[PDB]
Design an enzyme around this catalytic site. Sequence first.
Site, PDB file in Angstrom:
ATOM      1  N   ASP A   1      -9.258  59.509  23.802  1.00 20.81           N
ATOM      2  CA  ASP A   1      -8.348  58.759  24.603  1.00 20.81           C
ATOM      3  C   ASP A   1      -7.277  59.881  25.211  1.00 20.81           C
ATOM      4  O   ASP A   1      -7.018  61.046  24.760  1.00 20.81           O
ATOM      5  CB  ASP A   1      -7.772  57.538  24.195  1.00 20.81           C
TER       6      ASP A   1
ATOM      7  N   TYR B   1      -2.454  54.707  26.667  1.00 19.94           N
ATOM      8  CA  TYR B   1      -1.908  53.655  25.785  1.00 19.94           C
ATOM      9  C   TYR B   1      -0.692  54.032  25.301  1.00 19.94           C
ATOM     10  O   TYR B   1       0.270  53.128  25.191  1.00 19.94           O
ATOM     11  CB  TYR B   1      -3.177  53.293  24.549  1.00 19.94           C
TER      12      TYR B   1
ATOM     13  N   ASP C   1     -14.285  50.654  20.876  1.00 23.08           N
ATOM     14  CA  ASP C   1     -13.448  51.336  19.791  1.00 23.08           C
ATOM     15  C   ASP C   1     -12.430  50.418  19.269  1.00 23.08           C
ATOM     16  O   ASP C   1     -11.823  49.581  20.015  1.00 23.08           O
ATOM     17  CB  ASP C   1     -12.639  52.636  20.099  1.00 23.08           C
TER      18      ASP C   1
ATOM     19  N   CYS D   1     -25.157  43.033   3.395  1.00 26.99           N
ATOM     20  CA  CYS D   1     -25.164  44.380   4.019  1.00 26.99           C
ATOM     21  C   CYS D   1     -25.855  45.329   3.413  1.00 26.99           C
ATOM     22  O   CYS D   1     -25.890  45.421   2.206  1.00 26.99           O
ATOM     23  CB  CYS D   1     -23.660  44.588   3.886  1.00 26.99           C
TER      24      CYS D   1
ATOM     25  N   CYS E   1     -25.020  48.580   3.242  1.00 28.73           N
ATOM     26  CA  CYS E   1     -24.192  49.688   3.062  1.00 28.73           C
ATOM     27  C   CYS E   1     -24.059  50.216   1.515  1.00 28.73           C
ATOM     28  O   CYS E   1     -24.684  49.406   0.753  1.00 28.73           O
ATOM     29  CB  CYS E   1     -22.811  49.605   3.483  1.00 28.73           C
TER      30      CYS E   1
ATOM     31  N   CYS F   1     -21.867  48.095  -0.813  1.00 35.08           N
ATOM     32  CA  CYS F   1     -22.548  46.709  -1.338  1.00 35.08           C
ATOM     33  C   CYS F   1     -23.631  46.805  -2.108  1.00 35.08           C
ATOM     34  O   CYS F   1     -24.242  46.049  -2.815  1.00 35.08           O
ATOM     35  CB  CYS F   1     -22.980  45.939  -0.076  1.00 35.08           C
TER      36      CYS F   1
ATOM     37  N   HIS G   1     -17.594  50.259   4.028  1.00 29.63           N
ATOM     38  CA  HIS G   1     -18.345  48.920   4.239  1.00 29.63           C
ATOM     39  C   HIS G   1     -18.032  48.363   5.556  1.00 29.63           C
ATOM     40  O   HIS G   1     -18.889  48.021   6.100  1.00 29.63           O
ATOM     41  CB  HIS G   1     -17.818  47.788   2.976  1.00 29.63           C
TER      42      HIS G   1
HETATM   43  C1  LIG Z   1      -3.943  49.880  17.811  1.00 28.35           C
HETATM   44  O1  LIG Z   1      -3.843  48.678  18.376  1.00 28.35           O
HETATM   45  C2  LIG Z   1      -4.527  47.639  18.035  1.00 28.35           C
HETATM   46  O2  LIG Z   1      -5.842  47.637  18.427  1.00 28.35           O
HETATM   47  C3  LIG Z   1      -5.932  47.207  19.923  1.00 28.35           C
HETATM   48  C4  LIG Z   1      -5.648  48.345  20.703  1.00 28.35           C
HETATM   49  N1  LIG Z   1      -5.649  48.120  22.075  1.00 28.35           N
HETATM   50  C5  LIG Z   1      -5.783  48.895  23.150  1.00 28.35           C
HETATM   51  N2  LIG Z   1      -5.885  48.421  24.366  1.00 28.35           N
HETATM   52  C6  LIG Z   1      -6.158  49.596  25.330  1.00 28.35           C
HETATM   53  C7  LIG Z   1      -5.895  49.780  26.576  1.00 28.35           C
HETATM   54  C8  LIG Z   1      -5.846  51.135  26.797  1.00 28.35           C
HETATM   55  C9  LIG Z   1      -5.519  51.616  28.409  1.00 28.35           C
HETATM   56  O3  LIG Z   1      -5.431  50.673  29.219  1.00 28.35           O
HETATM   57  N3  LIG Z   1      -5.391  52.985  28.589  1.00 28.35           N
HETATM   58  C10 LIG Z   1      -5.711  53.897  27.673  1.00 28.35           C
HETATM   59  N4  LIG Z   1      -5.930  55.324  28.094  1.00 28.35           N
HETATM   60  N5  LIG Z   1      -6.001  53.804  26.460  1.00 28.35           N
HETATM   61  C11 LIG Z   1      -6.030  52.350  26.091  1.00 28.35           C
HETATM   62  C12 LIG Z   1      -6.211  51.908  24.943  1.00 28.35           C
HETATM   63  C13 LIG Z   1      -6.120  50.654  24.219  1.00 28.35           C
HETATM   64  N6  LIG Z   1      -6.045  50.052  22.988  1.00 28.35           N
HETATM   65  C14 LIG Z   1      -4.964  46.226  19.939  1.00 28.35           C
HETATM   66  O4  LIG Z   1      -5.492  44.685  19.687  1.00 28.35           O
HETATM   67  C15 LIG Z   1      -4.409  44.068  18.753  1.00 28.35           C
HETATM   68  C16 LIG Z   1      -3.654  43.476  19.622  1.00 28.35           C
HETATM   69  C17 LIG Z   1      -5.598  43.177  17.909  1.00 28.35           C
HETATM   70  O5  LIG Z   1      -3.748  45.359  18.054  1.00 28.35           O
HETATM   71  C18 LIG Z   1      -3.704  46.504  18.700  1.00 28.35           C
HETATM   72 ZN   LIG Z   2     -21.370  46.612   2.768  1.00 26.68          ZN
END
Ligand SMILES: CO[C@@H]1O[C@H](CNc2nc3cc4c(=O)[nH]c(N)nc4cc3[nH]2)[C@H]2OC(C)(C)O[C@@H]12
Ligand SMILES: [Zn+2]
Lengths: 370, 370
Positions: free
Chosen positions: A93, A97, A267, A305, A307, A310, A336
């Site tokens: 990335d 973000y 991811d 599972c 893995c 498990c 896991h």
């Molecule tokens: C670590 O936070 C939790 O994991 C999810 C991450 N969410 C997410 N959106 C993204 C959007 C972008 C983007 O527009 N640009 C770039 N460059 N990288 C991105 C990376 C992103 N990572 C969230 O999901 C929840 C809310 C469950 O917890 C958060």
């Molecule tokens: Zn497992």
Amino acid sequence: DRPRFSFSIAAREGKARTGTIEMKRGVIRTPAFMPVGTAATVKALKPETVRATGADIILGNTYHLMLRPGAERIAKLGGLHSFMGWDRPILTDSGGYQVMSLSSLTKQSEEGVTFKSSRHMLSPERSIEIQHLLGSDIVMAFDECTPYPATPSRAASSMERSMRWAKRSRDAFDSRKEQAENAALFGIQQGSVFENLRQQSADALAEIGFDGYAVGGLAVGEGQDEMFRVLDFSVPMLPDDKPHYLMGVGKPDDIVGAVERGIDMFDCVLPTRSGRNGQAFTWDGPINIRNARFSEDLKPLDSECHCAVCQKWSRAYIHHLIRAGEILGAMLMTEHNIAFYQQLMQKIRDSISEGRFSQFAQDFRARYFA
Amino acid sequence: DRPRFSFSIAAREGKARTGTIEMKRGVIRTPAFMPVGTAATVKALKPETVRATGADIILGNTYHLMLRPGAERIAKLGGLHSFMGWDRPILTDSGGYQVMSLSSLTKQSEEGVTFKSSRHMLSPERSIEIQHLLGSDIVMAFDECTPYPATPSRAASSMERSMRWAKRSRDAFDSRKEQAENAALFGIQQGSVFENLRQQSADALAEIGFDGYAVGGLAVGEGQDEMFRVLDFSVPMLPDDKPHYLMGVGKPDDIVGAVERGIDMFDCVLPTRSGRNGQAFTWDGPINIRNARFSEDLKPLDSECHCAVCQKWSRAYIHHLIRAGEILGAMLMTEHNIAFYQQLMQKIRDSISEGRFSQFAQDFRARYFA
Ligand SMILES: CO[C@@H]1O[C@H](CNc2nc3cc4c(=O)[nH]c(N)nc4cc3[nH]2)[C@H]2OC(C)(C)O[C@@H]12
Ligand SMILES: [Zn+2]
Ligand SMILES: CO[C@@H]1O[C@H](CNc2nc3cc4c(=O)[nH]c(N)nc4cc3[nH]2)[C@H]2OC(C)(C)O[C@@H]12
Ligand SMILES: [Cl-]
Ligand SMILES: [Cl-]
Ligand SMILES: [Zn+2]
């Protein structure tokens, strides 16, 4: 030998696709789940264990590695692959973000973003350069993840800046011959939840041209119904013949529904982070292994599972480890959960290949939410 | 099939011996180092990794497992071996060290010791019973580790009580037929630093009769010169044809000198605990991987070590992991340190077998302290 980048679609069902990305460092089976390795480690796992679970590619982060241990340092040491001992593809990335999540530490301008802990700068040019120094295989354009919710005006302004930054990212990548010849560059669609802005963003990215296209600006608090609504119109706007990457998603049911909407790559920190916190994924839904009901449960985390966790250890043992704060508890939960995610992706790939993915999705949801 | 217990001495040099202990669950090569697994885990290592480093036996602890997850619980779940996934011999300490180290939580009497966090009781009978419930292969008598320093009067009183408790431990073990037929029982010599008390203790233990004899009451703050002085007279007092186990020792040079004085078995938290804290053992002495001088050092932790960590990862990477608080840093440091300890034991065994242990000890010390 493998090409720099080739995406092939082997089978389709509705909007869902399955296939492969071939790159110099390996083949990526799609739909793909990328374990997150922000600090040059997938937390609590050796790289060989990450590979043993079925992962073809992992995710690193420009922002975190810029700060610690440093991008120039990693380059001097031979690059991220050698440094951490993962020789397969790595997607990085770009920092976009953190432009949003750490905005209180930032000064933002058209040039880029300065972060204040020591000060560190990111820009399209510097982000692409850092990803080169790391030796990233899939380089992400430097963007801004628009905060949610956003007004239409602010979503438009943010998206427009991201598209200007996407062109700067493209040019920076192309002007570094070694990077252009050996890595791939993905653009990131923005536009918040607004169809017209998503369309403008997709059009801008396709005009520039990228090796793959991420749907950015989601998994930012909007919830699943809204995320799916945005995917419904946003994914068809992207070039069909390139990978579609949904950043930061997600829970197992998020992944299934996103594949139904044309996403090829994912991811998420959920399997690693929530595993360390005691949440184990199972085909019957998540469980919290800390719960007293597991203290004498001799069954494995999940009854099907495959893995290594498990195969050997009980819920009761892992319950004890997590309650005690033992490192082995984090190790076993994480292995896991990542293996579960990879088995989910394998079942998705196989069901699309066999033309029974819609049935798989229905059967999966009925059992997972029972 | 293997016997319940057989100790054979294959070669000797001075007071040093090398040989094997055969037990139902496996063979233990001596001199032996036992990684410590107090909470039913060798911290940060899967059991297969513990075995891959060369360990033949690990140590568990009656006191800690009594508290969490509970002795009766472990028995209900099939015993400690099944619970943690280690199928080879396990030696369990009896709780006698915690009688001293946690004495402020205790009420002590001739019957035993009650610990107050909830209250939990230990006695010769209950300690032996817990070790049975765990399924321990080498059961330690319930003793008191005399505090250091101790006056001659208090050392004598403590030792005399421990010898009465040793007889009670013997009788409790023998009265449980399944335990007596499948496990071994070691007695623990006390007497602080006093030759006459050490002799009385050795005589009492030999009269009772045990499968092996530990030197207790050391590694309690006395320092190496004094420990070696006590070993000089104490080890010859023990039966020559049974294993001699020095509890809680120690640093690499402590181990070498103790083998020179007739010790066959060791356990210590140093490789695991100090590994997690950033200390790596090398043939040129310990290093602290956190030190900035390692931030760009591409060499392995140790230049000769055969372990998997030294085959793959650099000092620079492990430095980054430990500085970042990453779990993989603890995992890699711990695997290397335990592997280093096992390679030390292998070099000791081989040099005794070849009649060149005195030369090995001199060469080891000259390089380790250079
Ligand atoms: C670590 O936070 C939790 O994991 C999810 C991450 N969410 C997410 N959106 C993204 C959007 C972008 C983007 O527009 N640009 C770039 N460059 N990288 C991105 C990376 C992103 N990572 C969230 O999901 C929840 C809310 C469950 O917890 C958060
Ligand atoms: Zn497992
Ligand atoms: C965890 O503490 C560090 O590791 C060494 C432990 N020392 C030690 N002595 C022991 C004696 C006995 C004994 O007499 N009876 C019974 N039942 N168990 C024993 C266990 C013992 N463990 C210490 O060594 C230093 C001081 C370096 O740190 C301490
Ligand atoms: Cl994580
Ligand atoms: Cl430890
Ligand atoms: Zn090593």
